[PDB]
Amino acid sequence: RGSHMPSPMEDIEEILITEEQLKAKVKELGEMITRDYEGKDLVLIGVLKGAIMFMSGLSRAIDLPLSIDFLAVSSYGSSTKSSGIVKIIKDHDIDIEGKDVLIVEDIIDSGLTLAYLRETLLGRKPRSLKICTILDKPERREADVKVDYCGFKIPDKFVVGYGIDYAEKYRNLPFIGVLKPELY
Amino acid sequence: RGSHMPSPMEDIEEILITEEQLKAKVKELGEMITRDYEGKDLVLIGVLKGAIMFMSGLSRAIDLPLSIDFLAVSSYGSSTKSSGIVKIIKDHDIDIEGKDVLIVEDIIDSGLTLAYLRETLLGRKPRSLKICTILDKPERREADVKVDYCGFKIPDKFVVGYGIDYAEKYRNLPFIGVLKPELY
Amino acid sequence: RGSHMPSPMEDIEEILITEEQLKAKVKELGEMITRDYEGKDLVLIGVLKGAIMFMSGLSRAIDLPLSIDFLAVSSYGSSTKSSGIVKIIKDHDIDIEGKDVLIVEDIIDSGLTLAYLRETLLGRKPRSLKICTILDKPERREADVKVDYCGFKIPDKFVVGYGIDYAEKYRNLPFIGVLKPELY
Amino acid sequence: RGSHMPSPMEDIEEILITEEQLKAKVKELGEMITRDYEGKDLVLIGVLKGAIMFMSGLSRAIDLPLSIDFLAVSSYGSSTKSSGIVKIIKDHDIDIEGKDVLIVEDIIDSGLTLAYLRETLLGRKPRSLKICTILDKPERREADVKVDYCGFKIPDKFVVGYGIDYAEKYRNLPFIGVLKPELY
Ligand SMILES: [Ca+2]
Ligand SMILES: [Ca+2]
Ligand SMILES: [Ca+2]
Ligand SMILES: [Ca+2]
Ligand SMILES: [Ca+2]
Ligand SMILES: [Ca+2]
Ligand SMILES: [Ca+2]
Ligand SMILES: [Ca+2]
């Protein structure tokens, strides 16, 4: 029988963070941000496409009159890997000067690209600029970035899910799972 | 006392569709799409930024190895209003030729811009092209568009929430609500 | 001695069209277009980056109150080659509805991508849409495109110059030349 | 008689810089750059759409194996005026790290946007970064920018031509002229 077992879940070796754990953490972070940004001009900026799930969940967990925007970027080649420099394919449309920007990330590891985007956004004179990520791989750090809000710290395993892909697949997994080596 | 009442919920006159109703409908639609697209090469394409909430929820409710992509568009002026013609600010990166594309929309009313995007995507030779929207205002139709999957049909009220904005605000409301006229 | 001979001209096997021939043809075409578009709402649209030299020269040879705009595109992969389908990286900003658009091309060979862009522009309802190219390789045609204005017809040789590149180089040659096989 | 006098030249009050003067200056600057960048990895980067005429002419006057690229930008509103901050609509595709970049400008007045783009390009680690402009209005300066190559210094008159527009018109004038106040 050459039938298939199509569910993306079949390609996962183990679940590191469950859907419920993600849901609870998003609620937690959102309540914190609601308190911290009262009276502020909050703009959530996420980097497509990995940030979509966390952006959606986190924003709905923040009880404030915030705005949302996105950046779409691409690599210049054997340069983005060691410097974190990226090309802008879609820039944010909201004028962030004098506003309180919160970068919303899916995962932070080397911190190289994040540091580069941080400097680019700072160049637009926001009143404040902070960072929030649902996942962090501290052991992978190659640059100094301050993570103001962090969901979960995990080891450097090959993960996918909740927006994180592998060749554009697995973003729709409702949890963070370790991808079976046979797939990569 | 000049204190404020910052919650975006305070600007809502009435809730048309609750968070729970949205959650249940997304689960329902996702289970249907999971069945209908088994064996297909599913690519969900949403139009930023309104489609973010529905895209996130619907994708996670589809138990298939799908890919996600986005389009970011803008108006040409007093032309997009009567023809639905739009400028492409961010095109999709995934090659959809020979694939099964499902347009994911936040709301469909006139259907003008949707019809225009549909024709543009058809020009890229996908194997199939369907449309799914969480909200539909049938009375507003100005063009003939077939909605393959539809969450809720609503009257032509001024709504915001679940990704739908008013001057970039209210996208983070977890429900679909009618905006108080004082705000617009 | 390992000294170099840096001039891009050293990489040319033969000159097919001289700088003077190009200059005279641009003047000729511009005078024709000046006559044909009197009273029209002329918008010259070129595809970056190859069209830059011809766009600059042709526009300055047209004695009419025209506007200029550009499209920047990219390939989707093993699809643009047989269908001419392309991704839009930079769309034109000018609203061309009801206007008289003249596509300005560097070279036309298969006509596949040109045909695709033509259909895309027609979708924006211009009053008229014509095509002008400085170079044409008729033997390479794979689609039916009408060239309203044409500078020179040439055999299918490997050419560069006057905006036409090879790995981003040679666009600055003031003539159309055949590239030495050793370079490609 | 309600006949028109369509030539863009009819809207010019006086010619500040003739076509021949521009041609000679472009030849001059190009010969200088040819000498200065021998052995360098020259990348000319211009800001659309005003830089098109000068980019075309200057590049063809440089006898070196250079590459050309462009940036397309937009304003964020009442912010770009005092800070020079701009949104990126089209970023350059060439990786400029370790390369010798020459910004090619149509006109420099306040220097605000130029200074902002300069900082953005420096962030991509080019080996060297210089600036070349065909026109300069020194009295308009609001920021400190070093112009390595300059064609002509002019008073702060309302000019158009050689790529410089007024409501998208006049870019095709072969000279730099003062626009009649009746048109603006
Ligand atoms: Ca599998
Ligand atoms: Ca990311
Ligand atoms: Ca309120
Ligand atoms: Ca929409
Ligand atoms: Ca050589
Ligand atoms: Ca071309
Ligand atoms: Ca006039
Ligand atoms: Ca400029």
Side-chain angles (χ1 to χ4, degrees), chain B residues 5 10-11 183:
Chain B
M5 287 190 77
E10 286 295 305
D11 298 339
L183 284 305

Side-chain angles (χ1 to χ4, degrees), chain A residues 76-79 83 85-97 116 120 123-125, chain D residues 76-79 83 85-97 116 120 123-125:
Chain A
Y76 273 109
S78 181
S79 329
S83 61
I85 297 169
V86 293
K87 174 168 58 184
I88 306 304
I89 303 301
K90 177 63 176 70
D91 210 338
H92 63 265
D93 297 301
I94 295 175
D95 178 0
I96 62 173
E97 172 169 33
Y116 178 77
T120 301
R124 288 165 176 169
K125 310 173 68 257
Chain D
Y76 273 109
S78 181
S79 329
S83 61
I85 297 169
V86 293
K87 174 168 58 184
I88 306 304
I89 303 301
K90 177 63 176 70
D91 210 338
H92 63 265
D93 297 301
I94 295 175
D95 178 0
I96 62 173
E97 172 169 33
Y116 178 77
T120 301
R124 288 165 176 169
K125 310 173 68 257

